[PDB]
Amino acid sequence: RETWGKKIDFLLSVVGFAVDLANVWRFPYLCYKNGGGAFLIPYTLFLIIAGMPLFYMELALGQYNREGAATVWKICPFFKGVGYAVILIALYVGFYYNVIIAWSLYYLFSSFTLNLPWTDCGHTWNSPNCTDPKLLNGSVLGNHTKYSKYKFTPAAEFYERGVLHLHESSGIHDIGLPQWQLLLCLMVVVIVLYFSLWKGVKTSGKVVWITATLPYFVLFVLLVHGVTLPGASNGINAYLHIDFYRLKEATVWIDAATQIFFSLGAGFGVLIAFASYNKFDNNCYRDALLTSSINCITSFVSGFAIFSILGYMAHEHKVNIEDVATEGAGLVFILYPEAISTLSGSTFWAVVFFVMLLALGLDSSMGGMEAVITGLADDFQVLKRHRKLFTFGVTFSTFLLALFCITKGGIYVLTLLDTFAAGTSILFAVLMEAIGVSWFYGVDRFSNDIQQMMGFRPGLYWRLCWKFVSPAFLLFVVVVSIINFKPLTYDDYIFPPWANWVGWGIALSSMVLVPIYVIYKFLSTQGSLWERLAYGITPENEHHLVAQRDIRQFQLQHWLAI
Amino acid sequence: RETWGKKIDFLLSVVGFAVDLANVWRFPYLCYKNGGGAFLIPYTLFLIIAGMPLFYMELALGQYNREGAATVWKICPFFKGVGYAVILIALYVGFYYNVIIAWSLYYLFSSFTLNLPWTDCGHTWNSPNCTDPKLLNGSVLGNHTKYSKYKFTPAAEFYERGVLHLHESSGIHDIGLPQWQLLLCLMVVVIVLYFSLWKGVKTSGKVVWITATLPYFVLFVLLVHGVTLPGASNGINAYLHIDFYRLKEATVWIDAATQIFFSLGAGFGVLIAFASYNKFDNNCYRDALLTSSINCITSFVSGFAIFSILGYMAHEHKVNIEDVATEGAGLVFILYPEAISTLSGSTFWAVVFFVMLLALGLDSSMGGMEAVITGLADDFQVLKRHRKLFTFGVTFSTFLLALFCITKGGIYVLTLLDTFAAGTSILFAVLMEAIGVSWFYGVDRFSNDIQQMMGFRPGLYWRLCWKFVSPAFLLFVVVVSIINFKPLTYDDYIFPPWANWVGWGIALSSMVLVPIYVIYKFLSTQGSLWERLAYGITPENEHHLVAQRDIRQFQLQHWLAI
Ligand SMILES: CCCCCCCCCC(=O)O[C@H](COC(=O)CCCCCCCC)COP(=O)(O)OC[C@@H](O)CO
Ligand SMILES: CCCCCCCCCC(=O)O[C@H](COC(=O)CCCCCCCC)COP(=O)(O)OC[C@@H](O)CO
Ligand SMILES: Fc1ccc(C(OCCN2CCN(CCCc3ccccc3)CC2)c2ccc(F)cc2)cc1
Ligand SMILES: Fc1ccc(C(OCCN2CCN(CCCc3ccccc3)CC2)c2ccc(F)cc2)cc1
Ligand SMILES: CC(C)CCC[C@@H](C)[C@H]1CC[C@H]2[C@@H]3CC=C4C[C@@H](O)CC[C@]4(C)[C@H]3CC[C@]12C
Ligand SMILES: CC(C)CCC[C@@H](C)[C@H]1CC[C@H]2[C@@H]3CC=C4C[C@@H](O)CC[C@]4(C)[C@H]3CC[C@]12C
Ligand SMILES: CC(C)CCC[C@@H](C)[C@H]1CC[C@H]2[C@@H]3CC=C4C[C@@H](O)CC[C@]4(C)[C@H]3CC[C@]12C
Ligand SMILES: CC(C)CCC[C@@H](C)[C@H]1CC[C@H]2[C@@H]3CC=C4C[C@@H](O)CC[C@]4(C)[C@H]3CC[C@]12C
Ligand SMILES: CC(C)CCC[C@@H](C)[C@H]1CC[C@H]2[C@@H]3CC=C4C[C@@H](O)CC[C@]4(C)[C@H]3CC[C@]12C
Ligand SMILES: CC(C)CCC[C@@H](C)[C@H]1CC[C@H]2[C@@H]3CC=C4C[C@@H](O)CC[C@]4(C)[C@H]3CC[C@]12C
Ligand SMILES: CC(C)CCC[C@@H](C)[C@H]1CC[C@H]2[C@@H]3CC=C4C[C@@H](O)CC[C@]4(C)[C@H]3CC[C@]12C
Ligand SMILES: CC(C)CCC[C@@H](C)[C@H]1CC[C@H]2[C@@H]3CC=C4C[C@@H](O)CC[C@]4(C)[C@H]3CC[C@]12C
Ligand SMILES: CC(C)CCC[C@@H](C)[C@H]1CC[C@H]2[C@@H]3CC=C4C[C@@H](O)CC[C@]4(C)[C@H]3CC[C@]12C
Ligand SMILES: CC(C)CCC[C@@H](C)[C@H]1CC[C@H]2[C@@H]3CC=C4C[C@@H](O)CC[C@]4(C)[C@H]3CC[C@]12C
Ligand SMILES: CC(C)CCC[C@@H](C)[C@H]1CC[C@H]2[C@@H]3CC=C4C[C@@H](O)CC[C@]4(C)[C@H]3CC[C@]12C
Ligand SMILES: CC(C)CCC[C@@H](C)[C@H]1CC[C@H]2[C@@H]3CC=C4C[C@@H](O)CC[C@]4(C)[C@H]3CC[C@]12C
Ligand SMILES: CC(C)CCC[C@@H](C)[C@H]1CC[C@H]2[C@@H]3CC=C4C[C@@H](O)CC[C@]4(C)[C@H]3CC[C@]12C
Ligand SMILES: CC(C)CCC[C@@H](C)[C@H]1CC[C@H]2[C@@H]3CC=C4C[C@@H](O)CC[C@]4(C)[C@H]3CC[C@]12C
Structure with missing residues (x-):
């Protein structure tokens, strides 16, 4: 098998693997939806007791078995049907993760202008219900009109109408035809993705080089800008106030677990595929510690900056922080552009930010596609030779099934996928993984493998987490997800019951692959x-x-x- | 390879291969839509100059090459991408052919009653606009209300509302959720289909035994009943009157060509797969002659009976023959039940007719699935060993993609598939086949193969048809289909332009497989x-x-x- 180059295996190269589209795009709205502050405690808890142990376990398993996502269960066949599961899960992620890159790409095409399109109203996509904060002298409708989500801001109007064209759709039932702009954007995205996978694993490249310094620099600049804004202090206070009533709910814990698994990569097969090309003496313990610490710090600073920008926008618009912006997958594309517009030289900073989040998205999607391809090639050796055609077919199928999210009402399908395709399904997958590794395979054999690989046995804490703590918490979050399931809703659009049934069916498509495989193995x-x-x-x-x-x-x- | 048993290879066993769901279900409404009488001349012409030559050619090719649909192009690789085409075409057919069987199955469940549900109004599905011919004394709305399609008859009400539930949908955009009755029917259909394929080709069985005598008996009984009905003579006159204005149109020729290819099986890969398991001395010439003659006679008598029933219904309802019934895929399920209801002992005859058309549908779909599986197994030898799992996956995918046609507005998708998936695509496929066999491979080598197989060379007529007549006529019908394309319309529902674009895209999915493959072969x-x-x-x-x-x-x- 191939081996990662020394450039990506450096001690300071873990920072590249410690940032993801999830940390910059998903974490913000997931924390804003749960109030903020009350979401950090479950996040940190699931990171220290569930996220990091499973991260270390998957790293060690992938380094020891030298197999893909599914084939890594060569130590226990009855569990190979769960590998496929996470593979499908990863594919499901791509079905909408690539649509996000396209969005940023469109923003890139909107960034090479002297006057940003999200700065003020007066364009074609801008509806009559467009209130610019600087145009209070005219008072078309006032800076404050209503407080549900305030989708009348220039950035929100440019995002929903100028980019997604959501105004031309009333629901998921009438999405219509895909926009040609988003069509070309997704075409360019999948073209860049194909020529970044087709020659196998890339040991080192500019992609993994720029994603280690640009994200941190952009986040630092955004923090320095937000801490000196009017109203930003109010958002800071709203981020450092923990509402324990939210902790009494179950949705916060589910969101924290899902965000942990998205940021760390556990539950998609990416960690095992990555460790399959590592060295036999690579210290997964230090890697896991550094990844968890840097991810926690990045999530904290990202939430702080997001709440600062939210407070600034609430002060400029004279609305409440809980109703100044939306709680969907497009929150960052509304907060960050307006924050950049306030900085001197908004064009350059916007271009840099769009190049950064476009690069982060491409690296995140590449990793996923490489994990899927590695798993399916370790399963079918014909793919190890037909890599080119297999990657072409995978990218073509992903493009075809993502044409749904680039439609006028494609944000609804994107939210449905982000909530159900990688919701309880990934939790059940990682629970089955923990059960098959700690109970069926045994913690003693795993500890012996870790000792023969890195030269030391895991402590009592790691083994107790792998065997008792993490499986119990995963079962608990699965139970509170299934029993206390809430109907999926957008900012103001409510999904019909059949949409929830389709989402549950999509989740079960991945979930039942574990039972179906045990049946297949038993009969064969x-x-x-x-x-x-x-x-x-x-x-x-x-x-x-x-x-x-x-x-x-x-x-x-x-x-x-x- | 396997060989067909002597029971199916008998001289009088060609009658089983000379009847199909198309001859009993598709031909009737295709002839009624084109007026009747003016459709027989293009049908017979395309049969004698295009249908029978291509039938003989495909039979000889499948008997000589001993390969599937795609692999039969081992004599000319650049054409292997067209085999896949017809394979996909066959699959497309299944996507709605199986939905038809389910319909008949539901009718079977409606046949074990003393009072047939399509006899009179007064049921739950019957709308207030339900006019029974025997209830003229009450005169709720009169026997004659309007003349567009007269969908107010008890049979039409039971079909559209009691079976398809079309009243709960306004178009292809709001089909909704699949009916649970049709769901269970399609489940039973695919279950019977799986256990009829899973052990390879069935040399002989009850299925191919009952489909040789029951269809002819049912057609004879229906003819004897129709020739003694009031108003039936009017339908006979409307069937024997050739309107040459219809011949001046291009739609009639396209419908005749499509019906010929559906009845004979050319353009789906079924003929090649069937001949791949024949003997080396099997006389394909006699088989083709007998098949063409019996198919022509069966189509003629079926159209005669259909027009007799149409005249009877027009006399009973006091409406015009052109507006007494619909022109969709559900014409037979309205004409035949009312004709059976008039016969003494309607229950027994209805049960026999439903068992007959259910058996004909199952044999027609089996043949198609076996052709697809044989082609894909000759392409991939792994399927020759994993036949069971491959057939399971094929049936599961067919069921999933047919769930669309068992929806409330599933008849629209079924018509779209029957018009575009096997429309100009199959014409282009058979044109490419004729070009690759007669021009690239050469008529001399084909004639030598026929001489070394059956002991004689084809005459000048057959070679001139294979090389000049049939390719020219196929090019002509393709041109008149592409240039003179008419927008697809239902009985009264008009399909939106995007539906026509989706249909054309589905057709191009199969059409462009020929070019894409020549590119792949050139680069590889x-x-x-x-x-x-x-x-x-x-x-x-x-x-x-x-x-x-x-x-x-x-x-x-x-x-x-x-
Ligand atoms: C949503 C319902 C799907 C039910 C479809 C159920 C078939 C079950 C076959 C099955 O489980 O065989 C696998 C290999 O097959 C595969 O690829 C993946 C099969 C998973 C299909 C899921 C597709 C979902 C879109 C296991 O094969 P193996 O015995 O472990 O190894 C064979 C070879 O791949 C490597 O040795
Ligand atoms: C609607 C756009 C689809 C574009 C997708 C375009 C890939 C083109 C690969 C290709 O053409 O390779 C074939 C074998 O691959 C197949 O199965 C069938 C491929 C056809 C895919 C159509 C699926 C449509 C739902 C030819 O392979 P071969 O070199 O003749 O033989 C390889 C082995 O199968 C037997 O030797
Ligand atoms: F084989 C591999 C090759 C490369 C990578 C890179 O990781 C990408 C970074 N994220 C990827 C997946 N994220 C969440 C999953 C969401 C997702 C998205 C799309 C489809 C499916 C799932 C977690 C991490 C990488 C980058 C720097 C580096 F130093 C090492 C590896 C990983 C495996
Ligand atoms: F491998 C084979 C095994 C059996 C058969 C049987 O033929 C079935 C009879 N029709 C099948 C296909 N029809 C039109 C295509 C429509 C269609 C439908 C569904 C899916 C795709 C396409 C033409 C003929 C048969 C029956 C009696 C017999 F004596 C010999 C063969 C054929 C090939
Ligand atoms: C085709 C294979 C690869 C599986 C695809 C799985 C995903 C992409 C499928 C499964 C169910 C699908 C959904 C089913 C029904 C609807 C409602 C319709 O009004 C818009 C599309 C939408 C919302 C579909 C989007 C795509 C979807 C989520
Ligand atoms: C099986 C998967 C991987 C590949 C095939 C996917 C095909 C069948 C799907 C994927 C996305 C789909 C499109 C999504 C949305 C629309 C807009 C609608 O107004 C008409 C249909 C149309 C244009 C769909 C046509 C069919 C489509 C192209
Ligand atoms: C091969 C089959 C299975 C899938 C085909 C997918 C591709 C070719 C189809 C699916 C949906 C299609 C889009 C649907 C609607 C529009 C909007 C309009 O501006 C016309 C072009 C455009 C942008 C189409 C381009 C082609 C398209 C992207
Ligand atoms: C609708 C579009 C965006 C789907 C994606 C199409 C991509 C995957 C396809 C389209 C044309 C393809 C290329 C066509 C020909 C060649 C030359 C050959 O020597 C290597 C592969 C290569 C370079 C192909 C790579 C894959 C490719 C770029
Ligand atoms: C020789 C041994 C290793 C067998 C090799 C068989 C391989 C090449 C076959 C068997 C299983 C197949 C997969 C089964 C199902 C799917 C899902 C479908 O939506 C796209 C194709 C895809 C992904 C197939 C690709 C080809 C595949 C991987
Ligand atoms: C569903 C839509 C997106 C189309 C997907 C088509 C995919 C699944 C198909 C198209 C062409 C196929 C390839 C064609 C030929 C070969 C060579 C064979 O020795 C191994 C399998 C392999 C490499 C196939 C793998 C699956 C493949 C890539
Ligand atoms: C209910 C359906 C839709 C989903 C689950 C289907 C599962 C349980 C079925 C479908 C097809 C089945 C396979 C079909 C044939 C064989 C070959 C032989 O070795 C027996 C087991 C095996 C390998 C079966 C295992 C179980 C199987 C995979
Ligand atoms: C998924 C793979 C196997 C390819 C499937 C091909 C066929 C079955 C697909 C291709 C395009 C599809 C259509 C695209 C869009 C619509 C409009 C929607 O309002 C109802 C479903 C309907 C009418 C789809 C039915 C199924 C369809 C015809
Ligand atoms: C790729 C093919 C072969 C297999 C997967 C097909 C799946 C994704 C498709 C096939 C038919 C589809 C269904 C057809 C119609 C409806 C009714 C609608 O109100 C909600 C979605 C729902 C319930 C669809 C869900 C997705 C579905 C099940
Ligand atoms: C696995 C994925 C890809 C496809 C799932 C297909 C099956 C399981 C789904 C697709 C559409 C579904 C149907 C959609 C709507 C109805 C009507 C109502 O009475 C509930 C059950 C019923 C009848 C569903 C049964 C399950 C169903 C048939
Ligand atoms: C939704 C449904 C109708 C889809 C079709 C499912 C069919 C194809 C599946 C469901 C369960 C399967 C069976 C499960 C187990 C066995 C026993 C094994 O020794 C041979 C295969 C056999 C007999 C399978 C054949 C295929 C099968 C019948
Ligand atoms: C060892 C040699 C012969 C290679 C064998 C590879 C075979 C098993 C692979 C390669 C191409 C594959 C097919 C490519 C594409 C599709 C369409 C998809 O919708 C269902 C799976 C299906 C039908 C695949 C089934 C498995 C397949 C046939
Ligand atoms: C798209 C929906 C309907 C699901 C379709 C799944 C199909 C394409 C998949 C599911 C399981 C797959 C099989 C799983 C394992 C093997 C054994 C391998 O040695 C050859 C391929 C073969 C025989 C695969 C062929 C393709 C297959 C049947
Ligand atoms: C435009 C897209 C969507 C459809 C057509 C894509 C065709 C032309 C492309 C897509 C992927 C390509 C293949 C990708 C890689 C290889 C391997 C090498 O041997 C060169 C040729 C070959 C085998 C290519 C042949 C052409 C190919 C099949």
């Missing part, structure tokens, strides 16, 4: 129930132990190792 | 333009002639063989 195995179960719960390299009637899983000492 | 071949073209236009067993610089296609004597 020749022998009695004992032999079938033994072949299903034992590694492929120890199937001879089935003949010797010596199975560790059939002993009480295996399940009580701890 | 290593060598200069001369060597690439030689490897692309020469059989796989003669590629050594490329090294000797002796290619027949590069000589004028090859293209001027005649």
